[PDB]
């Protein structure tokens, strides 16, 4: 029986003197078992003996100090097994999921200790988790920048903050495990709950594993959320607008849209209506010109290093090569002018509208009938399922090693690939999601300012007539009027500012209307802008070029990781 602990470290902030000055572990199941010390050597000695599963919140940080220690004490990275070595799962983008430490076997059973990231099961900060789950949290925090030399004695106050931090996580994981959510990720917890509802027998039949090439072709037709800013209102500031958000976007498409399942049938040329294979992805070749008065639809995203959804308005001379779901293709034909269209071939799929209703009915009920902890978990169950279908291909990741200067280094690991769940599903759930947002914005073309996956920003404060019949404060899939603003400024995608009418507070602040309001709250939304930097944004300050050296960023140094301030700039 594998024990489970909730751990944490407290470290120094000096680049030249980076080290762990306090640690702590608590038994997720028995919160009476726990220890707080000031020696990493002492913690690691325990780690090697415990033969259990440990969780750190945001392993990307703690894991650096851990690997640093292992590498200095006879441990080397090893792709799989081999006594006195450790394996890892760090993604190409630097996301840490696991540190497996092996010490050999004994009587044909291996002796080890695996470390995981609790941030993958509960994707929020500790404080937030404390508030939302109704967990006792100590007011304030350690003086993160107080001198702590070798030999430092943890004071009784600091001692309670460490115990509290690890206890908050310990209570959350426990509640989560007592609810049957016993996975490494929240995403996998959803898939388990889903598979538990339709059987691993029906699952396997409904979501077969496609060939490597067949999966790659499907992936060609996958896109993310629709995030677009009207060039017209670009950078210039405006006044008086409204914002509409879809009530649970993804669970809504999954609830009643025609979704794919089963083995695809390959066809040549243009798709012909097939009652049994209602859905399809078509490989087409053409040239196009966005029509006058229509929003761009054909996108290109996630490029080489940095993204920022780019929407083409024309092929401009060159014949384009595209793979589109029938949902995306239908929108393309309306918004653009297509030239010399050549249908090459595609994929047909069986489809149904009832694969997710039971799973969604079950957890939406629990969500509506619960509070705090159980309620946040219900939301996680409902929100993390979509992600499992629109998952990635190769598991190629970063492999650590210790450099001569004492700090960690990383190199690309050998190629490595896993198995898709069912790519066709992720393609169509996002397509319908985009179709929902796009058609609504296009219907309000005259007043449209901005779009971001599940929301639309319009000028004016009056609900458009064409949207009236699909607006609702709580109904699944309906557009909920989320706020009205007196003025705003949009610099770029996901980069805007608004003055929101905030209804008088009868004890607590809410969104108000231009008639019934009390406060005018200023809110900022920006790419990598911290709450510290946001508290310096002003309407004539907010513009491309804005910068400030207050954005902390991790840096591998001997010892482990340290946070340094790096210039954040709105470009």
User: Which residue, 340, 358, 399, 336, is CA-closest to 89?
Assistant: 399
Least separation in angstroms between residue 157's CB and Mg ion is 11
Question: With binding defined as CB under 5 A, does residue 23 bind Mg ion?
Answer: no
- Pick the closer one to Mg ion by CB: 141 or 263: 141
Q: Is 165 annotated as belonging to a binding site?
A: yes
Contact residues for 319 (Cβ-Cβ < 8 A; gap 6+): 285, 286, 287, 340
Q: SS3 string of 389-400?
A: HCCCCECCEEEE
Alpha-carbon separation of residue 310 from 229, 299, 456, 525 (angstroms): 10, 6, 18, 20
Least separation in angstroms between residue 165's CB and Mg ion is 5
**Helices 372-389 & 357-368 angle (0-180, nearest 10):** 160
- Pick the closer one to Mg ion by CB: 73 or 155: 155
Longest dimension (CA), the chain: 76
Least separation in angstroms between residue 407's CB and Mg ion is 25
Stretch that binds Mg ion, among 133-141, 192-200, 279-287, 292-300 (CB under 5 A): 133-141
Q: Which residues of 448-486 are buried (b: 16+ CB within 10 A; e: fewer)?
A: bbbbbbbbbbbbebeebeebeeeeeeeeebbbbbebbbe
Which one-letter DSSP state was computed for residue 415? P
Least separation in angstroms between residue 173's CB and Mg ion is 18
Question: With binding defined as CB under 5 A, does residue 276 bind Mg ion?
Answer: no
Instruction: Work out which of 5, 75, 161, 233 binds Mg ion, going by CB under 5 A.
Output: 161
- Pick the closer one to Mg ion by CB: 165 or 454: 165
- Pick the closer one to Mg ion by CB: 141 or 330: 141
- Decide if 517 contacts 501 (C-beta within 8 A): yes
**Number of residues forming the site for Mg ion (CB under 5 A):** 3
Least separation in angstroms between residue 126's CB and Mg ion is 8
Question: With binding defined as CB under 5 A, does residue 321 bind Mg ion?
Answer: no
Question: With binding defined as CB under 5 A, does residue 9 bind Mg ion?
Answer: no
Q: Is 549 annotated as belonging to a binding site?
A: no
- Pick the closer one to Mg ion by CB: 12 or 498: 12
Question: With binding defined as CB under 5 A, does residue 157 bind Mg ion?
Answer: no
- Decide if 385 contacts 190 (C-beta within 8 A): yes
Phi and psi for 58 in degrees, rounded to 5?
A: 80, 70
Least separation in angstroms between residue 57's CB and Mg ion is 11
* Secondary structure (DSSP) of 212-241: HHHHHHHHHT-----EEE-GGGBSSEE--E
What is d(CA 321, CA 231) in angstroms, rounded to the nearest whole number?
Answer: 26
Least separation in angstroms between residue 141's CB and Mg ion is 5
Least separation in angstroms between residue 529's CB and Mg ion is 24
Question: With binding defined as CB under 5 A, does residue 422 bind Mg ion?
Answer: no
Tokens of 342: 């050549």
Stretch that binds Mg ion, among 31-39, 165-173, 246-254, 307-315 (CB under 5 A): 165-173
Cβ-count burial of 204 within 10 angstroms (0-12 exposed, 13-18 middle, 19+ buried)? exposed
Stretch that binds Mg ion, among 46-54, 140-148, 198-206, 554-562 (CB under 5 A): 140-148
Instruction: Work out which of 30, 41, 141, 196 binds Mg ion, going by CB under 5 A.
Output: 141
- Pick the closer one to Mg ion by CB: 155 or 439: 155
- Pick the closer one to Mg ion by CB: 163 or 457: 163
- Decide if 328 contacts 431 (C-beta within 8 A): yes
User: Which residue, 563, 571, 555, is CA-closest to 532?
Assistant: 563
Q: Is 250 annotated as belonging to a binding site?
A: yes
Q: Is 454 annotated as belonging to a binding site?
A: yes
Q: Is 515 annotated as belonging to a binding site?
A: no
Coil, helix or strand for 164?
helix
Q: Is 367 annotated as belonging to a binding site?
A: yes
Q: Is 306 annotated as belonging to a binding site?
A: no
Using Cβ positions, the residue closest to Mg ion within the complex turns out to be 161
Instruction: List, in sequence order, the alpha helices (H) in 228-318.
Output: 249-256
- Decide if 209 contacts 400 (C-beta within 8 A): no
Question: With binding defined as CB under 5 A, does residue 462 bind Mg ion?
Answer: no
Least separation in angstroms between residue 10's CB and Mg ion is 7
Least separation in angstroms between residue 9's CB and Mg ion is 11
* Secondary structure (DSSP) of 2-70: --EEEEEEEE--BTTB--EEEEEEEESS-TT-EEEES-HHHHHHHHHHH-SEEEETTHHHHHHHHHHHH
Stretch that binds Mg ion, among 60-68, 86-94, 158-166, 318-326 (CB under 5 A): 158-166
Binding residues for Mg(2+): 141, 165, 245-246, 452, 454
Binding residues for 5-methyl-UTP: 250, 367, 379, 454
Binding residues: 141, 165, 245-246, 250, 367, 379, 452, 454
| Residues contributing to the site for Mg ion (CB under 5 A) | 141, 161, 165
């Amino acid at each position: 029986p594998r024990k489970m602990y909730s751990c944490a470290f407290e470290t120094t902030t000096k680049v030249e003197d980076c080290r762990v000055w306090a640690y702590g572990y608590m038994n997720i199941e028995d919160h009476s078992e726990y220890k707080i010390g000031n020696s990493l050597d002492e913690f690691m000695a325990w780690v090697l003996k415990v033969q259990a599963d440990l969780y750190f919140h945001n392993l990307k940080f703690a894991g650096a100090f851990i690997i640093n220690w292992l590498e200095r004490n006879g441990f080397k990275w090893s792709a799989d097994g081999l006594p006195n070595t450790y394996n890892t799962i760090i993604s190409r983008m630097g996301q840490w999921y696991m540190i497996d430490i092996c010490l050999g076997y004994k009587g044909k059973r291996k002796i080890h200790t695996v470390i995981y990231d609790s941030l993958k099961k509960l994707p929020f900060p500790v404080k937030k988790i404390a508030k939302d789950f109704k967990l006792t949290v100590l007011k304030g925090d350690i003086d993160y920048h107080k001198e702590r030399p070798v030999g430092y004695k943890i004071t009784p106050e600091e001692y309670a903050y460490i115990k509290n931090d690890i206890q908050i996580i310990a209570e959350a994981l426990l509640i989560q495990f007592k609810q049957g959510l016993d996975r490494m990720t929240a995403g996998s917890d959803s898939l388990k709950g889903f598979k538990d509802i339709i059987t691993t027998k029906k699952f396997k039949k409904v979501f077969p594993t496609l060939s490597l090439g067949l999966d790659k072709e499907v992936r060609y037709a996958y896109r993310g959320g629709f995030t677009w800013l009207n060039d017209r209102f670009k950078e210039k500031e405006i006044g008086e607008g409204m914002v509409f958000d879809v009530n649970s976007l993804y669970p809504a498409q999954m609830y009643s849209r025609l979704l794919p399942y089963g083995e695809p049938i390959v066809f040549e040329g243009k798709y012909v209506w097939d009652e049994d294979y209602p859905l399809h992805i078509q490989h087409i070749r053409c040239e196009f010109e966005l029509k006058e008065g229509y929003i761009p639809t054909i996108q290109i995203k996630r490029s080489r290093f940095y993204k920022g959804n780019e929407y083409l308005k024309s092929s401009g001379g060159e014949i384009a090569d595209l793979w589109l779901s029938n949902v995306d293709l239908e929108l393309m034909k309306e918004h653009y002018d297509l030239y010399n269209v050549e249908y090459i071939s595609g994929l047909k799929f069986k489809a149904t509208t009832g694969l997710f209703k039971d799973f969604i009915d079950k957890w939406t009920y629990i969500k509506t009938t619960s509070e705090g902890a159980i309620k946040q978990l219900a939301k996680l169950m409902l929100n993390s399922l979509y992600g499992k279908f629109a998952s990635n291909p190769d598991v190629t990741g970063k492999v650590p090693y210790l450099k001569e200067n004492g700090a960690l280094g990383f190199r690309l690991g050998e190629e490595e690939t896993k198995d898709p769940v069912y790519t066709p599903m992720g393609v169509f759930i996002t397509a319908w999601a985009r179709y929902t947002t796009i058609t609504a914005a296009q219907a309000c073309y005259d007043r449209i300012i901005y779009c971001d996956t599940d929301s639309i920003h319009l000028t004016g404060t009056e609900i458009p007539d064409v949207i009236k019949d699909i607006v609702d404060p709580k109904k699944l899939g309906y557009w909920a009027h989320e706020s009205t603003f007196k003025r705003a400024k949009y610099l770029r995608q996901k980069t805007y500012i608004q003055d929101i009418y905030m209804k008088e507070v009868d004890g607590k602040l809410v969104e108000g209307s231009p008639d019934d309001y009390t406060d005018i709250k200023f809110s900022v939304k920006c790419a990598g802008m911290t709450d510290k930097i946001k508290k310096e944004v002003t309407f004539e300050n907010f513009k491309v070029g804005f910068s400030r050296k207050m954005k902390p960023k991790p840096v591998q140094v001997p010892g482990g990781v340290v946070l340094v301030d790096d210039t954040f700039t709105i470009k």
